[PDB]
Design a protein around this ligand. Structure first.
Ligand SMILES: Nc1nc2c(ncn2[C@H]2C[C@H](O)[C@@H](COP(=O)(O)O)O2)c(=O)[nH]1
Ligand SMILES: [Mg+2]
Ligand SMILES: [Zn+2]
Lengths: 158, 263, 14, 83, 1111, 94, 110, 104, 39
DNA sequence: GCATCCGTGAGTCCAG
DNA sequence: TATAATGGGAGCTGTCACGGATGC
């Protein structure tokens, strides 16, 4: 068992799904500029399209693995439960996916790259928002967890 | 009121609070004896009440009394009893303890589930009194005092004291703990195996219950002393005697990581 | 609430 | 009456436990007024006192159990049979 | 060796001086190189000009000057002195009535000086003043959290200069002002300022419903004097409304520039937000006897216009980096200087009343102790003044560029929510989104971007190239965030042919929003990707292939690398490793062209073009703050021709001017018998054999012999009851000789202390009688070596009393410092890491023969477990390994820039060039393929790695181009059943080593009040058995072990004494007793007048004090 | 896992009672110098030194083995405490 | 004097007084040493006769904490002061011979 | 006897005085030259106890043969120094003061 | 932990509190640990 | 009955 | 031990969310 960069297998369905998503995004933009749907509905449709596309490329990664590379190290580690879960493998092989602003509002533009391909500096900076938000969330959550544990210990100790 | 190493003096804030109280009380007694007007006596009694308040619970009412040239409030009795640093939480429900150690942990694949790797020198200091008694039983030292004076210098340590220490720890177990201790499996008892080097060796299967890994974690060691403490550790707290989680019931020590991968 | 202010007020009454 | 964990912990009958949890001055003032006696029922009470907790090997159920070998057992049996 | 660099991005400008945020700040603050008449009103000059004249006799400030340092830096570090310069101030005392002038230059004490690298030396310890981010002063408008259609106007001055003012429209309609927690109608303050109902009705009348709420008839009925008295009664109840007192208070609150200071930045921001011009840095003025408004009416007008919905009025993002500014060393030091100066001025005003009102000089009036105390406080005990992190040069260089949101005048940890810790869209190019502490301080401590620099107003600026039409100029414009929000800024990697944009659609940012835009819409362009990240983050190759959470650790751990004796620069560099060695002064360079005259281990002598012969002394084996050795090795030879800026000596952790934080080792990525289970690491004993990861560490020990009321402490070789073997390595005076090895227990400095008066126990009387030897008057107090420490004595320093040049603190006869150095080899428990966040402890050091090895016999060095890669999503290390394999066989290093680097096809090309060397050498040597290589090729084409049917060589090349090789198990000889990634990786030995952290205690020191053991390894303390460990013991049901923790193993005196004696006698441990800390609790409750009674089952009192406290 | 720990848990209605029994018996063995033991010379727990097999110094090991044999009688109110102590000090002096 | 509660560090978790050991109360090692010293002294004193060991216990104050003069110990045992000084000398001499033979009390000389 | 309960109650001034071994009349701590506790101050050996075991202040009684004896010259009882962790003093207020806990 | 009837004297409340608290740091469209504390 | 103020909490161990 | 002197001075701000008293 080893890991080389070639073990992050980009599936051939990715370019197809991405081109389909671009044509759908253009269809939604054309439906917006004609005043049929509002800015809110357009934003929601774009997010939903990219979410379903992300799930599609996940399934494509794992299907290409199962059928054409059943002993691929990433696939083996994920399936056996040794290490890894589908979303991490997706970020390695499929697309990174949607990111969110510091406000929590999700960006319209997803990160189309994978860690095998490499991100753009702009994609990286967009990712940093969520990474920092999660770090601060954890750092503030451990205190509430510990406090709660001590409350429970003091109420149940006898 | 104590003298530190450098001959300087260190004192408690209660002394300054008591001094304030005694000064204002004596001055009130003198002001009453001299029959001072009511405004002066009133101010003095108000300051006396303020001083009693600052002694019992400083900062509770009004501004906290501080030492000269400092913004740090003085530490009253209430501040002593209450709080995370208070007497209860810091010295009563938890204590620093003797016969304990701490070191960096390392994977111990060769260990059995009931074992852990314990550095020699850690065990030498942790079991030091048992080792002195055993060095007295064997001919290594005339008495306890000579044995301790022999262990005091590292170059005076010969190779029979190590075999004596092996005889000492036989059958006994030590407690390994890793902070934070979230559930009762953050402390577990292991039979120690003396190892060269300065690292604690931890069995892989118990890494999950400790949430331990080898990115630089450290663990604390404790030595149960009495035969009662040893019985409790060996029967109840032994790592191989707790295989299931008390929270769910599912196995806690289970094949994982590299193990699952190979199988 | 402020002992100095209160004592100054007591003083200013004479 | 339903109350959350904090208020229920502060309401416990043992004032040593309650004072060692939170609001130490409030607990201690009401307890000192009431003349409260702590019966040392739970764990925190006995841990503060440095006593042997009433659980596990300290439980009154298992605490007084004795061990004796059949040789000494029968020896004392015959010693008490002759009195 | 060949260094092949990648990337097509051309940086039009180099990185700024990396320590300039410290250097230029302090330089502008002190103005010591400016002749006093040409000094601007800033820094120390501004502090003096603000404090003076002292009006009450009138004492006035003319000028100041700074002298030369009484001692050089090395002397300061040696003697525990502060590197500082004497500050003199020329003041003239003028009697306004007499006309008499008495003018004098008074000495105000010493001001600490910044060294070349941007640090300070305080009491011999190197320290760094960390910049502090905070809200910029000014006028902000934020949505009222209660009422959605209403807003709050905040007027915020500089910290510790005046109060915050809150303007709010209450539900009842009247406008309210909040100052010092007190609220009142703003109409009253407007009436004090001279406004009348006419001026307000015309100025604000455009907005109908609000001005009617503003109107208060009784306020306009009374003239400004009555409104002033009324406002003084509203603000200060109980204080008699004396009109002079009211003018004084309102002036000192709003209009006094001495008590109320908006920033110069705050002034500019108010002028820019409200569209007005400020005559000064105050909210109003006292002119011609009355009050004249400056700020209030424009802010009220903006508030009303924002409430009505008038276009052009916006709420303010308070986390925008245009509303958040940095206070650097100069500003904070100037603040503390200003405080000390104001206290000195209070002392002066107090002196201008007492004594003789006629005979007074500026020397008699000024007391500098307040100023000396304030500066001493700021530098010694402040939170922003930190012990310098100089583990390696990068540690300090990054330390100086730290940005703290904490400290005095800033956030506490509970005051900081998500908004502060967040990465703002304006951190792009200014504050690094990666490098931040991991833990509770995340988002508070941050680091400065690479191309970023802080301007004179305190806002961080980033450079951008101007783009006119489709042509990208080479001129760079440094913008703040607010100015950046105006333009459309394309990305630095956008295609270019010449200076013209070569793409039909470019990626750009409008207010941080990413957008696809035509080259005609492009107003500016990024300088380089480097500008988005910090310096440490820029040292991570293939950073675009690493998840941010692991890149954070890579950055933060490069700070922790230990300088190694054979340290080398990585095979895959980013291009910043040379400039980092340059800007922090680790390495020594040539000032001008010339020829090398002399090369020693101790100095390098260069003869320049000028003909002058310059000698550079080399720092050799000097202990840093953290114990890592600082030492410069000469890299030139006698007679060598050098140019300007050429390297002369390599500093610590550098190789030929490149930053060398670790070593390049041959790594294989595979499981190995569980010895790399869960991030542990397996290493080859060959690493110890060739002294890789071996580092030098020096520890300083110190001892004082002082005067006692019982007699002198003497440092002597004569020590009671000690063998000659124990005193072997001590000289005549008692200090250890240089060069002698010391082990735990050995004596460094012998010392005798007179025993305290003690009546000998009758046992000692009979014992003394038996042996006939008298009891000595002194006692052994010698300084020994702590457990687990030791090494070679490399230096000793002795300082006596009465010898020239030295004076100790009162009572101290002599002080001896012993320096002990050690060569630490790598060992089990030491922590390694790479630049990608892969970190772990060494768990197994195997002999070379067990090590997995290449078919040609080459064993690998490190074995990393692949299971750490997929969860962590840091693939950059994989690419580093591939390129490192190629560079291992081609014998060359690389420069792969961040976000514009070596991409996969080029790495494949280099891998093929490498495979030719790897295999054609074998084929020419007369060797074919191995049988086991055929078996591995079989199992590999079963994996789909190689195409079936090709020759063995072609398939081995197909594997090599994937970075995988055939690997033989040294234990069996049988190969690993699959092809394995092997290549060269850069790995660093971090500062966390088992020798430092291992600790054990049986019994030892106890604390005074609680009688519990101490804590810390240095105090031989015990481990803390906290609340949660007690929970664990209770949940296990182990009552007796818990009772041991509570009583025998701590805090029970009788119990622990009896326990130790029982154990050394072989007896079982006794029943525990009452904990001493419970007795402390009982007595401390009695001190609170609460009676605590321990009762038995008959409710009868039980005495746990055993009759000692009962009469 | 301690030898036969499953059978040892089978013997008792509560594991903590087993712990108490083991600890009290180990104190008995330590006090009387192991010469009150119920083990036959071939059942004695051994320990490998550099010299050879010697008797296991660990009284807890001894106690658990003795418990496995079945020759020990445990329970509550089997004998007054002073009578037990004195009869054991008569059978096995110190 | 300086305050024992002087904060160490930028957190509120440590006080100066927490780094100051207690030098007054004897450590468990010291108490063990003193107890073993008393036990070895009584072991070596039982090698004498009860009368001469008693003269030594009265002379050096191991009984009652007071050191009795020769006239008092002689008036206690009925003998003359020179007789009690002589039996004290012979008891000390037998003790010195026992000590040179056994070497048990040397380690307590520190 | 074995402790089975713990009671907490208010303390009368009589109980406070029955705990007290003496009144602290002077704010002084220890002498600036001899470094010994000042009389009637916060560290007075006459109130709280002896600094060294079984030894009075001036050194007239230095062993356990006198225990419970109070030295006539210096006023110190000869007992174990540990009692300085136990024995309480008191202060007689000229005017009654409210215990802030029962007010605030 | 033993898949058998609990032994009399087991400190159940502490085990319960630890069992509830230990996964707390993992609780993350979802209300999560704030909801746990609300309850 | 509903605002508004005051007071009290806000994870563990290590190392400095 | 005697000219006359007669009301202070420093503040310090970016939580947050409960419980429980005290204000219309
Ligand atoms: N807060 C705190 N600072 C310490 C401690 N020990 C040392 N320091 C400070 C003062 C020293 O100049 C600096 C570094 O010393 P260190 O390498 O022993 O840190 C400690 O225990 N706590
Ligand atoms: Mg870890
Ligand atoms: Zn006396």
């Amino acid at each position: 068992i080893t890991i080389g960069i070639d073990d992050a297998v980009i599936p051939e369905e990715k370019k197809q799904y991405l081109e389909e998503a671009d044509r759908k995004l253009l269809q939604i933009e054309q439906a917006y500029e004609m005043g049929f749907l509002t800015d809110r509905e357009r934003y929601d449709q774009i997010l939903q399209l990219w979410t379903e596309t992300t799930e599609k490329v996940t399934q494509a990664v794992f299907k290409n693995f199962e059928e054409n590379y059943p002993f691929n190290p990433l696939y083996v580690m994920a399936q056996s439960g040794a290490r890894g879960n589908p979303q991490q493998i997706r970020q390695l092989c499929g697309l990174r996916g949607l990111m969110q602003k510091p406000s929590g509002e999700t960006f319209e533009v997803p990160v189309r790259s994978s860690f095998r391909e490499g991100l753009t500096v702009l994609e990286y900076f967009i990712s940093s928002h969520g990474a920092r938000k999660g770090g601060a969330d954890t750092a503030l959550r451990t205190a509430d967890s510990g406090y709660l544990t001590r409350k429970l210990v003091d109420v149940t100790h006898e | 009121m104590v003298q530190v190493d450098g001959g300087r003096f260190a004192t408690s804030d209660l002394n300054d609070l008591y001094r304030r109280l005694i000064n204002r009380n004596n001055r009130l007694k003198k002001l009453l004896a001299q029959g001072a007007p009511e405004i002066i006596i009133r101010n003095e009694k108000r300051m006396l009440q303020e001083a009693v308040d600052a002694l019992l619970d400083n900062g509770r009412r009004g501004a906290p009394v501080t030492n000269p040239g400092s913004d740090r409030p003085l530490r009253s009795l209430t501040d002593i009893l209450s709080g995370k640093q208070g007497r209860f939480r810091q010295n009563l429900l938890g204590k620093r303890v003797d016969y304990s150690g701490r070191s960096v942990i390392v994977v111990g694949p060769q260990l059995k589930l009931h074992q852990c790797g314990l550095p020699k020198r850690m065990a030498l200091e942790l079991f030091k009194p048992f080792l002195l008694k055993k060095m007295e039983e064997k001919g290594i030292a005339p008495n306890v005092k000579a044995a301790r004076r022999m262990l005091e210098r590292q170059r005076d340590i010969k190779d029979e004291v190590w075999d004596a220490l092996e005889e000492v720890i036989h059958g006994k177990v030590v407690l390994l703990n890793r902070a934070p201790t979230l559930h009762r499996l953050g402390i577990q008892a292991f039979q120690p195996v003396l190892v060269e080097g300065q690292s604690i060796q931890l069995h892989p299967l118990v890494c999950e219950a400790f949430n331990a890994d080898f990115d630089g974690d450290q663990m604390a060691v404790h030595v149960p002393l009495s035969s009662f403490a040893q019985a409790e550790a060996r029967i109840q707290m032994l790592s191989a005697h707790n295989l299931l989680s008390p929270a769910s019931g599912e196995p806690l020590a289970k094949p994982s990581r590299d193990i699952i991968l190979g199988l | 609430s402020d002992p100095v202010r209160q004592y100054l007020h007591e003083i200013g009454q004479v | 009456l339903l109350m959350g964990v904090t208020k229920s912990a502060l309401s416990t009958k043992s004032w040593l436990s309650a004072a060692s949890f939170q609001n130490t001055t409030h607990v201690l003032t009401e307890a000192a007024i009431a003349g409260k006696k702590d019966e040392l029922i739970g764990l925190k009470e006995n841990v503060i006192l440095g006593r042997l907790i009433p659980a596990g090997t300290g439980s009154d159920f298992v605490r007084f159990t004795q061990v004796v070998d059949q040789k000494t057992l029968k020896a004392i049996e015959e010693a008490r049979k002759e009195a | 060796m060949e260094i092949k660099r990648f990337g097509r991005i051309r940086e039009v400008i180099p990185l700024p001086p990396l320590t300039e945020i410290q250097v230029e700040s302090y330089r502008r603050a002190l103005q010591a190189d400016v002749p006093p008449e040409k000094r601007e009103n800033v820094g120390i000059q501004a502090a003096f000009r603000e404090t003076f004249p002292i009006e009450e006799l009138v004492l006035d400030f003319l000028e100041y000057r700074l002298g030369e340092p009484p001692f050089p830096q090395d002397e300061c570090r040696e003697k525990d002195l502060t590197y500082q310069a004497p500050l003199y101030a020329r003041l003239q005392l003028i009697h306004k009535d007499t006309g008499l002038i008495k003018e004098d230059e008074v000495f105000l004490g010493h001001i600490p000086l910044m060294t070349e690298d941007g640090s300070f030396i305080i009491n011999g310890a190197d320290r760094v003043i960390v910049s502090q981010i905070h809200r910029s002063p000014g006028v902000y408008f934020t949505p009222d959290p209660a009422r959605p259609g209403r807003y709050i106007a905040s007027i915020i001055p500089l910290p510790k200069r005046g109060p915050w003012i809150d303007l709010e429209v209450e539900p009842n309609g009247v406008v309210s002002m909040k100052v010092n927690k007190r609220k009142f109608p703003l109409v009253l303050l407007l009436r004090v300022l001279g406004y009348d109902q006419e001026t307000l009705a015309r100025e604000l009348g455009a907005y109908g419903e609000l001005v009617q709420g503003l109107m208060d008839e009784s306020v306009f009925a009374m003239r400004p004097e009555e409104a002033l008295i009324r406002l003084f009664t509203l603000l200060r109840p109980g204080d008699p409304p004396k009109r002079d007192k009211a003018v004084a208070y309102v002036y000192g609150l709003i209009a006094d520039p001495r008590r109320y200071d908006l920033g110069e930045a705050g002034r500019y921001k108010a002028e820019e937000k409200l569209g007005i011009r400020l005559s000064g840095r105050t909210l109003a003025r006292f002119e011609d006897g009355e009050f004249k408004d400056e700020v209030f009416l424009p802010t009220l007008r903006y508030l009303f216009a924002l409430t009505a919905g008038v276009p052009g009025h916006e709420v303010d993002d308070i986390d925008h980096l245009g509303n958040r500014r940095i206070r650097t060393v100069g500003e904070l030091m100037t603040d503390q200087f200003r405080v000390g100066l104001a206290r000195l001025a209070r002392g002066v005003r107090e002196r201008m009343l007492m004594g003789s009102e006629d005979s007074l000089t500026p020397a008699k009036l000024v007391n500098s102790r307040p100023l000396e105390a304030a500066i001493r406080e700021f530098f010694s005990r402040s939170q922003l003044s930190q012990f310098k992190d100089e583990t390696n040069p990068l540690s300090s260089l990054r330390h100086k560029r730290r940005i703290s949101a904490l400290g005095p005048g800033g956030l506490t940890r509970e005051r900081a929510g998500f908004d502060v810790r967040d990465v703002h869209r304006t951190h792009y190019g200014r504050i690094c989104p990666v490098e931040t502490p991991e833990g509770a301080n995340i988002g508070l401590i941050t680091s400065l971007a690479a191309y970023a620099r802080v301007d004179e107003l305190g806002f961080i600026r980033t450079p951008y190239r101007r783009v006119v039409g489709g042509v990208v100029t080479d001129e760079v414009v440094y913008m703040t965030a607010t100015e950046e929000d105006r333009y459309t800024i394309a990305q630095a990697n956008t295609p270019l042919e010449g200076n013209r944009i070569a793409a039909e659609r470019v990626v750009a940012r409008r207010k941080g929003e990413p957008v696809i835009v035509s080259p005609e819409e492009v107003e500016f362009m990024d300088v380089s990707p480097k500008q988005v990240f910090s310096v440490n983050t820029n040292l991570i190759p293939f950073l675009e292939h690493d998840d941010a959470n692991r890149a954070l650790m890579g950055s933060n751990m490069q700070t922790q690398a230990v300088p190694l004796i054979r340290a080398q620069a990585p095979v895959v560099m980013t291009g910043l490793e040379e400039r980092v060695v340059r800007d922090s002064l680790a390495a020594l360079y040539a000032e001008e062209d010339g020829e090398v005259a002399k090369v020693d281990g101790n100095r390098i002598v260069v003869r320049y073009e000028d003909g002058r012969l310059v000698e550079y002394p080399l720092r050799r084996f000097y202990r840093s703050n953290q114990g890592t050795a600082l030492d410069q090795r000469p890299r030139v030879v006698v007679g060598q021709r050098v140019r300007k800026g050429d390297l002369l000596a390599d500093g610590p952790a550098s190789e030929n001017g490149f930053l060398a934080l670790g070593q390049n080792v041959l790594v294989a990525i595979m499981p190995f018998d569980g010895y790399n289970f869960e991030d542990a690491i397996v290493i080859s004993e060959e690493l110890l054999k060739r002294d890789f990861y071996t580092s030098i560490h020096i520890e300083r020990y110190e001892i004082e012999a002082r005067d006692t009321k019982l007699g002198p402490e003497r440092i002597t070789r004569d020590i009671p009851h000690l063998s000659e073997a124990a005193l072997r390595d001590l000289d005549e005076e008692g200090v250890v000789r240089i060069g002698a090895e010391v082990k735990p227990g050995d004596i460094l400095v012998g010392r005798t202390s007179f025993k305290g008066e003690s009546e000998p126990t009758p046992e000692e009387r009979l014992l003394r009688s038996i042996f006939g030897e008298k009891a000595r008057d002194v006692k052994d107090t010698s300084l020994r070596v702590p457990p687990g420490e030791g090494g070679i004595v490399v230096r000793t320093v002795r300082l006596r009393r009465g010898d020239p040049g030295v004076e100790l603190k009162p009572g101290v006869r002599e002080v001896v410092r012993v320096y002990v150095a050690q060569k630490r080899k790598l060992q089990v428990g030491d922590k390694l890491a790479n630049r990608h966040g892969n970190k772990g402890v060494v768990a197994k050091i195997l002999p070379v023969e067990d090590m997995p090895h290449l078919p040609d016999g080459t064993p690998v060095d490190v074995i990393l477990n692949p299971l750490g890669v997929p969860s962590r999503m840091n693939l950059g290390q994989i690419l580093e390994t591939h390129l490192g394999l190629a560079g291992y066989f081609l014998g060359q290093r690389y420069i792969s820039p961040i976000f514009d680097g070596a991409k996969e096809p080029e790495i494949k090309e280099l891998l093929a060039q490498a495979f030719e060397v790897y295999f054609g050498k074998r084929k020419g040597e007369g060797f074919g393929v191995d049988k086991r290589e055929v078996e591995v090729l079989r199992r590999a084409e079963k994996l789909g790695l190689v195409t079936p049917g090709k020759t063995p060589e072609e398939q081995l090349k197909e594997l090599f181009l994937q970075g995988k090789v055939v690997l033989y198990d040294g234990r069996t000889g049988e190969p690993i059943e699959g092809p394995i990634v092997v290549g060269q990786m850069f790995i660093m030995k971090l500062y966390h080593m088992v020798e430092d952290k291992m600790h054990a205690r049986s019994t030892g020191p106890y604390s005074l009040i609680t009688q519990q053991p101490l804590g810390g390894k240095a105090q031989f303390g015990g481990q803390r058995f906290g609340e949660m460990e007690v929970w664990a013991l209770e949940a296990y049901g182990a009552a007796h072990t818990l009772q041991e923790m509570l009583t025998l193993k701590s805090d029970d005196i009788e119990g622990r004494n009896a326990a130790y004696e029982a154990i050394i006698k072989g007896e079982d441990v006794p029943e525990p007793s009452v904990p001493e800390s419970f007795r402390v609790l009982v007595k401390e409750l009695q001190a609170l007048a609460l009676d605590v009674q321990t009762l038995d089952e008959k409710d009868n009192p039980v005495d746990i004090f055993e009759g000692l406290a009962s009469k | 896992a301690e030898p036969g720990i499953d059978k040892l848990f089978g013997m008792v209605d509560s594991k903590y009672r087993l712990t108490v029994v083991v600890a009290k018996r180990a104190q008995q063995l330590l006090r009387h110098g192991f010469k009150n033991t119920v083990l036959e010379p071939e059942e004695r727990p051994k320990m490998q030194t550099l010299e050879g097999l010697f008797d296991d110094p660990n009284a807890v090991t001894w106690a658990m083995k003795e418990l496995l044999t079945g020759r020990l009688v445990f329970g509550e109110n089997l004998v007054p405490e002073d009578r037990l102590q004195k009869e054991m000090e008569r059978l096995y002096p110190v | 004097p300086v305050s024992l509660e002087t904060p160490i560090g930028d957190e509120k978790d440590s006080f100066y007084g927490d780094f100051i050991p207690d030098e007054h109360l004897p450590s468990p090692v010291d108490a063990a040493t003193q107890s073993l010293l008393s036990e070895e002294l009584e072991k070596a004193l039982s090698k004498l006769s009860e009368r001469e060991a008693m003269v030594l216990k009265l002379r050096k104050g191991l009984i009652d904490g007071r050191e009795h003069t020769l006239e008092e110990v002689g008036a206690f045992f009925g003998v003359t002061r020179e007789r009690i000084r002589q039996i004290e000398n012979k008891a000390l001499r037998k003790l010195k011979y026992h000590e040179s033979r056994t070497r048990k009390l040397r380690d307590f000389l520190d | 006897k074995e402790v089975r309960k713990v009671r907490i109650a208010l303390a009368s001034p009589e109980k406070i005085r029955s705990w007290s071994y003496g009144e602290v009349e002077k704010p002084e701590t220890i002498n600036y030259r001899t470094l010994k506790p000042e009389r009637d101050g916060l560290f007075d050996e006459r109130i709280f106890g002896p600094i060294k075991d079984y030894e009075c202040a001036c050194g007239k009684y230095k062993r356990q043969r006198f225990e419970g004896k109070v030295c006539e010259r210096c006023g110190v009882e000869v007992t174990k120094s540990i009692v300085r962790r136990y024995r309480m003093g008191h202060i007689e207020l000229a005017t009654p003061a409210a215990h802030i806990w029962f007010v605030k | 932990s033993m898949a058998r009837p609990v032994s009399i004297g087991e400190a159940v409340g502490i085990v319960a509190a630890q069992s509830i608290g230990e996964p707390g740091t993992q609780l993350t469209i979802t209300q999560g640990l704030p909801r746990v504390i609300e309850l």
